[PDB]
Protein backbone atom coordinates (compact mmCIF):
# COMPACT_ATOMS: atom_id res chain seq x y z
CA UNK A 1 0.00 0.00 0.00
CA UNK A 2 2.68 2.52 0.97
CA UNK A 3 4.79 1.66 -2.05
CA UNK A 4 1.66 2.08 -4.18
CA UNK A 5 1.04 5.53 -2.73
CA UNK A 6 4.70 6.50 -3.16
CA UNK A 7 4.70 5.34 -6.80
CA UNK A 8 1.48 7.18 -7.54
CA UNK A 9 2.50 10.32 -5.71
CA UNK A 10 5.99 10.92 -7.08
CA UNK A 11 6.66 9.07 -10.35
CA UNK A 12 4.64 11.59 -12.29
CA UNK A 13 5.12 13.08 -15.72
CA UNK A 14 5.88 16.82 -15.18
CA UNK A 15 8.75 16.11 -12.79
CA UNK A 16 10.59 13.52 -14.87
CA UNK A 17 13.20 14.23 -17.49
CA UNK A 18 14.20 11.87 -20.31
CA UNK A 19 17.84 12.66 -21.02
CA UNK A 20 19.99 10.96 -23.64
CA UNK A 21 23.47 11.54 -24.98
CA UNK A 22 25.50 9.95 -27.73
CA UNK A 23 25.11 8.94 -31.34
CA UNK A 24 21.41 9.71 -31.66
CA UNK A 25 19.15 12.36 -33.15
CA UNK A 26 16.80 14.67 -31.27
CA UNK A 27 14.21 13.91 -33.94
CA UNK A 28 14.53 10.21 -33.18
CA UNK A 29 14.43 10.60 -29.41
CA UNK A 30 11.42 12.93 -29.64
CA UNK A 31 9.75 10.31 -31.85
CA UNK A 32 10.48 7.46 -29.46
CA UNK A 33 9.47 9.50 -26.41
CA UNK A 34 6.18 10.32 -28.10
CA UNK A 35 5.68 6.66 -28.96
CA UNK A 36 6.41 5.36 -25.45
CA UNK A 37 6.23 7.92 -22.64
CA UNK A 38 2.97 9.48 -23.84
CA UNK A 39 0.01 8.68 -21.63
CA UNK A 40 2.25 8.04 -18.63
CA UNK A 41 0.84 10.34 -15.91
CA UNK A 42 0.34 14.02 -15.14
CA UNK A 43 -2.50 14.34 -12.62
CA UNK A 44 -2.08 13.95 -8.87
CA UNK A 45 -4.44 11.75 -6.91
CA UNK A 46 -6.30 13.88 -4.38
CA UNK A 47 -4.49 17.15 -5.15
CA UNK A 48 -1.73 15.99 -2.79
CA UNK A 49 1.22 17.92 -4.21
CA UNK A 50 4.53 17.65 -2.34
CA UNK A 51 6.48 20.87 -2.00
CA UNK A 52 9.94 21.81 -0.73
CA UNK A 53 9.60 23.77 2.39
CA UNK A 54 12.91 25.44 3.30
CA UNK A 55 15.05 23.73 5.90
CA UNK A 56 17.13 24.91 8.83
CA UNK A 57 20.88 24.49 9.10
CA UNK A 58 20.92 24.08 12.87
CA UNK A 59 24.59 23.83 13.68
CA UNK A 60 25.59 21.35 16.34
CA UNK A 61 27.74 18.31 16.89
CA UNK A 62 27.52 14.58 17.35
CA UNK A 63 30.45 12.45 18.36
CA UNK A 64 30.22 8.69 18.23
CA UNK A 65 32.95 7.38 20.46
CA UNK A 66 33.97 3.85 19.49
CA UNK A 67 37.61 3.24 20.44
CA UNK A 68 37.80 -0.19 18.82
CA UNK A 69 38.70 1.30 15.43
CA UNK A 70 42.09 2.00 13.87
CA UNK A 71 41.35 5.46 12.44
CA UNK A 72 39.13 8.40 13.30
CA UNK A 73 36.69 10.05 10.91
CA UNK A 74 35.91 13.75 11.23
CA UNK A 75 33.58 15.94 9.22
CA UNK A 76 32.92 19.62 9.77
CA UNK A 77 30.40 21.52 7.70
CA UNK A 78 28.94 25.00 7.36
CA UNK A 79 26.01 26.80 5.66
CA UNK A 80 24.48 26.02 2.29
CA UNK A 81 24.80 28.28 -0.73
CA UNK A 82 22.00 26.64 -2.70
CA UNK A 83 22.20 26.49 -6.48
CA UNK A 84 21.28 29.74 -8.17
CA UNK A 85 23.72 32.32 -6.82
CA UNK A 86 27.24 32.86 -8.26
CA UNK A 87 28.42 32.24 -4.72
CA UNK A 88 28.33 28.61 -5.90
CA UNK A 89 31.06 29.52 -8.39
Amino acid sequence: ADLTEYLSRHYKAPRMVLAAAGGLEHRQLLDLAQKHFSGLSGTYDEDAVPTLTPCRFTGSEIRHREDGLPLAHVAIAVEGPGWANPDNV
Partner: protein, 75 residues
Protein backbone atom coordinates in the same frame (compact mmCIF):
# COMPACT_ATOMS: atom_id res chain seq x y z
CA UNK B 1 48.59 12.61 31.94
CA UNK B 2 47.82 14.54 28.79
CA UNK B 3 44.68 14.26 26.71
CA UNK B 4 44.19 11.17 24.57
CA UNK B 5 45.49 8.08 26.40
CA UNK B 6 42.81 8.10 29.06
CA UNK B 7 40.56 5.09 28.49
CA UNK B 8 38.87 2.85 25.93
CA UNK B 9 35.20 3.69 25.25
CA UNK B 10 32.81 2.15 22.72
CA UNK B 11 29.05 2.37 22.29
CA UNK B 12 28.69 6.07 23.23
CA UNK B 13 27.05 8.88 21.27
CA UNK B 14 27.15 12.45 22.56
CA UNK B 15 24.76 15.01 21.07
CA UNK B 16 25.07 18.72 21.74
CA UNK B 17 23.86 21.97 20.24
CA UNK B 18 25.46 25.33 19.50
CA UNK B 19 25.76 27.82 22.36
CA UNK B 20 24.12 30.49 20.24
CA UNK B 21 20.85 28.83 19.35
CA UNK B 22 19.77 27.52 22.72
CA UNK B 23 18.88 30.42 24.94
CA UNK B 24 20.86 31.90 27.80
CA UNK B 25 18.58 31.03 30.73
CA UNK B 26 16.17 28.18 29.98
CA UNK B 27 13.28 28.45 32.48
CA UNK B 28 15.36 29.88 35.28
CA UNK B 29 12.30 30.62 37.44
CA UNK B 30 10.37 27.43 36.67
CA UNK B 31 13.03 24.80 37.22
CA UNK B 32 15.79 26.30 39.33
CA UNK B 33 13.77 27.20 42.42
CA UNK B 34 12.14 23.74 42.77
CA UNK B 35 15.58 22.33 42.00
CA UNK B 36 17.22 24.24 44.85
CA UNK B 37 14.30 23.27 47.07
CA UNK B 38 15.07 19.62 46.36
CA UNK B 39 18.76 20.32 47.04
CA UNK B 40 17.92 21.98 50.35
CA UNK B 41 15.61 19.16 51.43
CA UNK B 42 18.33 16.65 50.59
CA UNK B 43 20.91 18.28 52.86
CA UNK B 44 19.53 20.06 55.92
CA UNK B 45 18.80 16.84 57.80
CA UNK B 46 22.54 16.18 57.61
CA UNK B 47 23.77 19.78 58.03
CA UNK B 48 21.32 21.73 60.21
CA UNK B 49 21.03 19.72 63.53
CA UNK B 50 24.62 20.46 64.66
CA UNK B 51 24.28 24.21 64.20
CA UNK B 52 21.21 24.50 66.40
CA UNK B 53 23.25 22.66 69.03
CA UNK B 54 25.87 25.38 68.65
CA UNK B 55 23.21 28.09 68.95
CA UNK B 56 21.96 26.54 72.19
CA UNK B 57 25.56 26.40 73.46
CA UNK B 58 26.01 30.10 72.63
CA UNK B 59 22.84 31.13 74.47
CA UNK B 60 23.78 28.94 77.43
CA UNK B 61 27.30 30.35 77.56
CA UNK B 62 26.29 34.01 77.59
CA UNK B 63 23.45 33.35 80.05
CA UNK B 64 25.57 31.40 82.54
CA UNK B 65 28.36 33.98 82.22
CA UNK B 66 26.02 36.75 83.34
CA UNK B 67 24.48 34.60 86.07
CA UNK B 68 27.91 33.79 87.51
CA UNK B 69 28.63 37.50 87.24
CA UNK B 70 25.58 38.49 89.32
CA UNK B 71 25.83 37.76 93.03
CA UNK B 72 22.85 38.71 95.30
CA UNK B 73 23.59 38.39 99.03
CA UNK B 74 21.21 39.92 101.60
CA UNK B 75 22.33 41.52 104.88
Amino acid sequence: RQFGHLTRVRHVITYSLSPFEQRAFPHYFSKGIPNVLRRTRACILRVAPPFVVFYLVYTWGTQEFEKSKRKNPAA
